[PDB]
Amino acid sequence: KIIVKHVTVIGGGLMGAGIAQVAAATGHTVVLVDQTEDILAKSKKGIEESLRKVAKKKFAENPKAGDEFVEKTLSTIATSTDAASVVHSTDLVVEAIVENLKVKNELFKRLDKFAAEHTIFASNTSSLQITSIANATTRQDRFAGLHFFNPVPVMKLVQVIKTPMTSQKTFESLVDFSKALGKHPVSCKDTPGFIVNRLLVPYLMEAIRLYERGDASKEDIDTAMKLGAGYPMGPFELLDYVGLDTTKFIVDGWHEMDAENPLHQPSPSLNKLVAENKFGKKTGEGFYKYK
Amino acid sequence: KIIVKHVTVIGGGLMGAGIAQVAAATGHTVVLVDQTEDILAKSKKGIEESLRKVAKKKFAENPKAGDEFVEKTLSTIATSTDAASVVHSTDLVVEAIVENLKVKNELFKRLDKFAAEHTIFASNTSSLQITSIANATTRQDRFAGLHFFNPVPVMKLVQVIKTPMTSQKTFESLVDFSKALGKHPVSCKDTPGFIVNRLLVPYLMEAIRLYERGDASKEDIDTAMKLGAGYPMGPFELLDYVGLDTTKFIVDGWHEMDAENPLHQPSPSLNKLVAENKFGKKTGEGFYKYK
Numbered sequence A, B: 001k002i003i004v005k006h007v008t009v010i011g012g013g014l015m016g017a018g019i020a021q022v023a024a025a026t027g028h029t030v031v032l033v034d035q036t037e038d039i040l041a042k043s044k045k046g047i048e049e050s051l052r053k054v055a056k057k058k059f060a061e062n063p064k065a066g067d068e069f070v071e072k073t074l075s076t077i078a079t080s081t082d083a084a085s086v087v088h089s090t091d092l093v094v095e096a097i098v099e100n101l102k103v104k105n106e107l108f109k110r111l112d113k114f115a116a117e118h119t120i121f122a123s124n125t126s127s128l129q130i131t132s133i134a135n136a137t138t139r140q141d142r143f144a145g146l147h148f149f150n151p152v153p154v155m156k157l158v159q160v161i162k163t164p165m166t167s168q169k170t171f172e173s174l175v176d177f178s179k180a181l182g183k184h185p186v187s188c189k190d191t192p193g194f195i196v197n198r199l200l201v202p203y204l205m206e207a208i209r210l211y212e213r214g215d216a217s218k219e220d221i222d223t224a225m226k227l228g229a230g231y232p233m234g235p236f237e238l239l240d241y242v243g244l245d246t247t248k249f250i251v252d253g254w255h256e257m258d259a260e261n262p263l264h265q266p267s268p269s270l271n272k273l274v275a276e277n278k279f280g281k282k283t284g285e286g287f288y289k290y291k
């Protein structure tokens, strides 16, 4: 029954940076890992802009206390491009890299050799089966799903996924950690997309199809969902906010593992965008061009 | 270019009552129609209740303006059990009765004989093709879809659907009325479910199927979509709120039309609840039990 104090987040993108930000802000020492130094520089820079927004709103009467919160938080986030060494003595690895089983397995198979024994492994995968990733190691009793929601600083939900192999203690540690993060942990079964994505993705793909089918425009479909269903963001807005590349990988994956389910039919428009390197707010352009 | 001044709302259910409420709250003369005086008595009580909530918030710092707002609106909604006796001198008919093409056409075929020459006909149908309803009349150029969202007193959106026969004059008149209602009119083609329902319903069905499959409980699924995706309501809370009967009909219609589309595969649990007359909050019970 370990207590997560030292955390290693592999992946500094939309999710990693946020998970690192929250772990840091809530008193956990964090080491954010990524491929290059420029990437890490950008990530930590972004985490800073996110903290300032929080500061400028939370500490308007005492700005000096706001700078401390920001500095103290950024300070509790170390950067490194060497997962192998960092995990040597970490309490928990939270993998948030490209949505691709092969890559993720290769990653954990390696880290399984370098990481300490009490170390807990966790994937933030959207559509991959935890069991499938946990078996790329020999640490399945310490491997589980730990799913966050974009933007991590705002979304309160966290999905804690056990595999038939995950231990109760591993589970509890991830549950306590989740809480110490100020989130609302929810145990799910290891089913594709778990809960949210299994329902949310096919929907977003349906919005894309309704657009390709020529029945309406993205703008009207977005206004529709926001003003009619009360959603915070329209379908096309959310897609660009999540990342078209991540979205596409989630679908191709499901498509491949169930090629006769029309829900997961890849999209021509989605593939074209990702093929031209337009992934949304990520690259400044997706379905909508951003400033 | 007729100016909707007098409005005849047929059906005092979840929508109709709301639609009458808003029209009346905004200075239109309204007559709410339903099957029996008892039903009408109840619809009026619901509108009185909804109105007080609007008042306790749109006039929070002025009870007197609250009282006048409620009374003035209620006393502006006359009631009848036969719309044929009212439609010879009304500007617009907004139909909001059971989701069934036969019953709807039957209604408009009859009203088409009694209604004034200029009167416009509008259906608030969730999933039926406006063209299929307009054809029960010889008033096509004055027939269109004016789709509102539940609860009507709150949701800003209103889909104004034109068929290839609706005149520009009839369309424009409906747009003004929408704005007159304080809503945000959006022109949709006459496609099944139009925009919102074609994406929302299949989504809600997927939620049900994820539950029948045993993957997750109704409660975790609701908590998940709310906390993880920012949804105002979980899929089951929304199903009950909307009406399971209405949902079942919507799906059956699409299912009969596109029998091989798995998106519209009827739900055993949805059917059993409807068979036991558990339609949602309107009957005190659907997937959840209420007061």
Ligand SMILES: CC(=O)CC(=O)SCCNC(=O)CCNC(=O)[C@H](O)C(C)(C)COP(=O)(O)OP(=O)(O)OC[C@H]1O[C@@H](n2cnc3c(N)ncnc32)[C@H](O)[C@@H]1OP(=O)(O)O
Pocket: A228, A229, A230, B050, B051, B053, B054, B057, B125, B126, B127, B148, B149, B150, B151, B153, B154, B155, B196, B197, B200, B232, B233, B238, B242
């Ligand atoms: C089936 C089809 O054919 C087409 C369709 O309609 S699909 C269904 C579309 N509708 C949706 O998806 C509903 C989604 N849910 C929502 O957007 C929200 O839950 C909601 C608009 C119902 C309000 O819920 P909420 O945020 O929890 O509010 P609630 O706690 O219920 O009440 C508080 C507010 O809501 C309002 N409210 C709730 N029900 C109301 C009603 N029936 N009448 C007037 N006001 C109401 C109050 O005025 C109040 O305003 P304040 O914020 O100033 O206090």
Ligand SMILES: CC(=O)CC(=O)SCCNC(=O)CCNC(=O)[C@H](O)C(C)(C)COP(=O)(O)OP(=O)(O)OC[C@H]1O[C@@H](n2cnc3c(N)ncnc32)[C@H](O)[C@@H]1OP(=O)(O)O
Pocket: A050, A051, A053, A054, A057, A125, A126, A127, A148, A149, A150, A151, A153, A154, A155, A196, A197, A200, A232, A233, A238, A242, B228, B229, B230
């Ligand atoms: C793909 C998968 O595997 C799983 C998933 O993650 S699916 C995607 C899940 N996420 C969603 O569905 C996104 C839905 N969208 C939302 O709920 C909302 O749009 C939202 C939470 C992003 C906020 O949007 P919004 O209402 O427009 O707020 P915005 O105007 O953007 O900012 C206002 C608030 O949000 C916050 N905010 C937004 N982005 C932020 C960030 N990156 N960092 C810190 N705060 C942020 C601010 O704290 C701010 O607080 P104040 O109101 O006090 O000023």
Ligand SMILES: NC(=O)c1ccc[n+]([C@@H]2O[C@H](COP(=O)([O-])OP(=O)(O)OC[C@H]3O[C@@H](n4cnc5c(N)ncnc54)[C@H](O)[C@@H]3O)[C@@H](O)[C@H]2O)c1
Pocket: A010, A011, A012, A013, A014, A015, A016, A033, A034, A035, A039, A095, A096, A097, A098, A099, A100, A103, A107, A124, A125, A126, A127, A147, A148, A149, A150, A241, A242, A243, A246
């Ligand atoms: N996009 C979302 O909103 C969202 C929400 C929850 C979960 N997820 C899931 O979480 C994961 C994170 O996706 P993301 O949105 O943050 O994407 P992202 O593209 O923003 O970030 C991925 C990061 O991984 C890095 N990376 C790639 N290969 C690596 C490797 N071998 N070693 C170290 N770093 C590597 C990239 O340089 C990049 O910074 C995915 O599996 C995704 O399915 C995404």
Ligand SMILES: NC(=O)c1ccc[n+]([C@@H]2O[C@H](COP(=O)([O-])OP(=O)(O)OC[C@H]3O[C@@H](n4cnc5c(N)ncnc54)[C@H](O)[C@@H]3O)[C@@H](O)[C@H]2O)c1
Pocket: B010, B011, B012, B013, B014, B015, B016, B033, B034, B035, B039, B095, B096, B097, B098, B099, B100, B103, B107, B124, B125, B126, B127, B147, B148, B149, B150, B241, B242, B243, B246, B282
């Ligand atoms: N439920 C929703 O949230 C929602 C939102 C938009 C549109 N719609 C659509 O609007 C219509 C209204 O549905 P609703 O939710 O208000 O349902 P409801 O069951 O609450 O109300 C329907 C009302 O119609 C009356 N009615 C039935 N047959 C009638 C007839 N032949 N003549 C006169 N009155 C009759 C009933 O007595 C009842 O009061 C349906 O076509 C539905 O698909 C529903």
